Amino acid sequence: GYITPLD
């Protein structure tokens, strides 16, 4: 959700 869409 921050560094990568997955997070």
Residue carrying the six token digits 């560094």: 3
Query: Encoding tokens for residue 2?
Result: 């921050």
d(CA 5, CA 7): 5
* Token couple for 5: 């869409």
Half-sphere exposure of 5 (CA within 13 A, CB side): 0
Experimental approach: NMR
First to last CA, the chain: 4
Sequential DSSP letters for 1-7 = --SSTT-
- Residue 7: CB partners within 8 Å, gap ≥ 6? 1
